[PDB]
Amino acid sequence: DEDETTALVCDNGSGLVKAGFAGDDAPRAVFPSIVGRPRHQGVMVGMGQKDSYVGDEAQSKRGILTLKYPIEHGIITNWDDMEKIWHHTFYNELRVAPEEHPTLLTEAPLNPKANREKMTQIMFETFNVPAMYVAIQAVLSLYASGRTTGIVLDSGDGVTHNVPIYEGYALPHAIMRLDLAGRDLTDYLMKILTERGYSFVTTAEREIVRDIKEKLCYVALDFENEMATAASSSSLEKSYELPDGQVITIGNERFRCPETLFQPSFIGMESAGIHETTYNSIMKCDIDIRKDLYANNVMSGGTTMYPGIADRMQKEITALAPSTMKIKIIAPPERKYSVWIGGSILASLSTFQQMWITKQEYDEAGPSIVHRKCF
């Protein structure tokens, strides 16, 4: 065990399951969210004997299993494979058990009543846990980023948050989520890059969909004004060779997939987009922090990593805004771990320990104990 003060620190997210201890900058435990039921008698029998695969190794051998994930766009839909994922989150990758030792969780800026009582409950159930606390991603992100006032653009394998937060305090009312960040994005990219040609199909040709997007993506300066030249000329569409090898032009997906993060009308939605929200939660925030809110625009996480978005954030927020107000967008592309950083860095501290629930106050009160506790 480490010297740094005893907590487990587990960031629930939608792409990769991040967990670790107190003190760090990059994740101790990384794994995607999967547990796969194998299925065959005949050839599974014929060839194998052992197993079911989880996360890491399940990236490797997989064409023998049944690959579903168990969490989606937020609160866990079935927490059943989440349980054995958390079993895996504790008992070999870190290796330490939450049985003796204190434990933290992250959460969205504000969580609900009922399932977040049952969140508290599940820790005490299967995992036993003598002390747990649960702290906000946005607030901890901004403390990772070192700051006192900053409106944190979060955006993961699923959700985008836009929290106004002033000297540590997020604001009670200015609340909106975009549920665009990861899947709809990537798997409409699967939809289209497949119609463009080759069945990314069954046993061989599937998770190239998940290599490709990340490498190809700059967010362009404007759309159909490039898509005109694009088609007469031949530049931004690059002929790339994959583990099979036929001439693959990937070309819009680059700017297209994240132009959807701006405006979902490019798949086809009548509803909103990121640009509006960013401003709109500030326009329904507080008048004398509105000021500093536009003037402290910051970002966190996965889908934010993309090159071209400072150029977009300086472009289109100002494109709604008055003549009188002013935006300041702030840059740092370290940001792909900063929630797990914020959790890890805050875990270590003297101050934070007294704020723990002790399991004695669970048994006394119930899981509703969480509703008078975590700040």
Ligand X SMILES: Nc1ncnc2c1ncn2[C@@H]1O[C@H](COP(=O)(O)OP(=O)(O)O)[C@@H](O)[C@H]1O
What residues numbered 228-287 form the site for Mg ion, per CB under 5 A? Answer: 265, 284, 286-287
Interacting partner of 75 out of its own copies, Mg ion, ligand X, none (Cβ under 5 to 8 A depending on kind): its own copies
106 is a site residue for ligand X (CB under 6 A): no
The 3-state DSSP class for residue 56 equals helix
Instruction: State the number of binding residues for its own copies (CB under 8 A).
Output: 109
Inter-residue contact 165 to 152 (CB < 8 Å): yes
Strand-strand pairing, 8-11 and 103-107: parallel
117 is a site residue for Mg ion (CB under 5 A): no
- Helix, strand and coil content of the chain, in percent to the nearest 5, comes to 40, 15, 50
Instruction: State the number of binding residues for Mg ion (CB under 5 A).
Output: 9
Q: Which residues pair with 136 in a beta bridge?
A: 107
Residues 84 and 67: their CA atoms lie apart, in Å, by 14
343 is a site residue for its own copies (CB under 8 A): no
Which residue has 């991603």 as its token pair?
137
55 is a site residue for ligand X (CB under 6 A): no
231 is a site residue for its own copies (CB under 8 A): yes
Residues 261 and 255: their CA atoms lie apart, in Å, by 10
Interacting partner of 112 out of ligand X, its own copies, Mg ion, none (Cβ under 5 to 8 A depending on kind): its own copies
Instruction: Kindly tell me which residue out of 167, 354, 364, 372 binds Mg ion, with binding defined by CB under 5 A.
Output: 354
CB of 156 to ligand X, least distance (A): 3
Quick note: the x/- pattern for ligand X over 177-216, rule CB under 6 A, is: -----x-------------------------------x--
Interacting partner of 205 out of its own copies, ligand X, Mg ion, none (Cβ under 5 to 8 A depending on kind): its own copies
Instruction: Kindly tell me which residue out of 20, 32, 156, 367 binds Mg ion, with binding defined by CB under 5 A.
Output: 156
Residues 314 and 352: their CA atoms lie apart, in Å, by 37
Instruction: Kindly tell me which residue out of 9, 10, 13, 260 binds Mg ion, with binding defined by CB under 5 A.
Output: 13
301 is a site residue for ligand X (CB under 6 A): yes
198 is a site residue for its own copies (CB under 8 A): yes
Residues 107 and 114: their CA atoms lie apart, in Å, by 15
Interacting partner of 333 out of its own copies, ligand X, Mg ion, none (Cβ under 5 to 8 A depending on kind): none
Inter-residue contact 49 to 40 (CB < 8 Å): no
Give how far Cα 2 sits from Cα of 6, 21, 24, Å.
Answer: 8, 9, 11
Quick note: the x/- pattern for its own copies over 88-127, rule CB under 8 A, is: --------------------xxxxxxxx-x----------
Instruction: Kindly tell me which residue out of 28, 84, 206, 359 binds its own copies, with binding defined by CB under 8 A.
Output: 206
The 3-state DSSP class for residue 109 equals coil
The 3-state DSSP class for residue 115 equals helix
Residues 211 and 243: their CA atoms lie apart, in Å, by 12
Instruction: Select 22 or 341, whichever has its Cβ closest to ligand X.
Output: 341
Query: What residues numbered 129-158 form the site for its own copies, per CB under 8 A?
Result: 136, 139
Interacting partner of 53 out of its own copies, ligand X, Mg ion, none (Cβ under 5 to 8 A depending on kind): none
133 is a site residue for ligand X (CB under 6 A): no
Long-range Cβ contacts of 195-204 (<8 Å, 24+ apart): 196/249, 197/248, 198/246, 198/248, 203/63, 204/243, 204/244
**What DSSP string runs through 206-230?**
STHHHHHHHHH----S-STTTTTHH
Instruction: Select 4 or 179, whichever has its Cβ closest to its own copies.
Output: 179
Residues that bind Mg ion (CB under 5 A): 13, 156, 265, 284, 286-288, 339, 354
The site for ligand X (CB under 6 A) is made up of 13-16, 156-158, 182, 214, 217, 301-303, 305-306, 336, 339
